[PDB]
Design a protein around this ligand. Sequence first.
Ligand code: NA
Length: 90
Amino acid sequence: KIRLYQFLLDLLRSGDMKDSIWWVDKDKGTFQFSSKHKEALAHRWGIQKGNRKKMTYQKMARALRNYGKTGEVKKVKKKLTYQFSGEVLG
DNA sequence: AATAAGGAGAAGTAGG
DNA sequence: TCCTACTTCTCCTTA
Ligand code: NA
C-alpha cells in the first residue's frame, strides 16, 4: 500500500490536483498546499487508503509531521509548505 | 469572537 | 511478540 509521501509526490508529478497542491521550488523539492482546496486532496488520500473515517488535512498533517525525524518530508517555515528529501526525489 | 495553521501525546488499526 | 505506518482523538499555542 502506498505511503503518504509517495501519494503526494505522485500527485505533483501527474498534475491531477493542481488546484490543491503545487511545487514552489522544483529544484529544491518544496511544495505547498492550497488553503481553500487542500481538503479535497485529504479526502482523496483517505479514500485511496480505504480508511474508516473521512480524512482531513489535520489528520494528514499529523502523519506528515512523523516524517520529520526520518526526513522524507520536512515542514518549511512558510504557510502550508513542506519539502521532500533528495532521497525521496531521486 | 471566529478562523486557521501548526503542534503532539496517547491510544487504535493495518499488515506484516 | 512486537514493529510499521499511519489514523483517530483530544487538547494546546500562535497569529
Ligand atoms: Na487548518
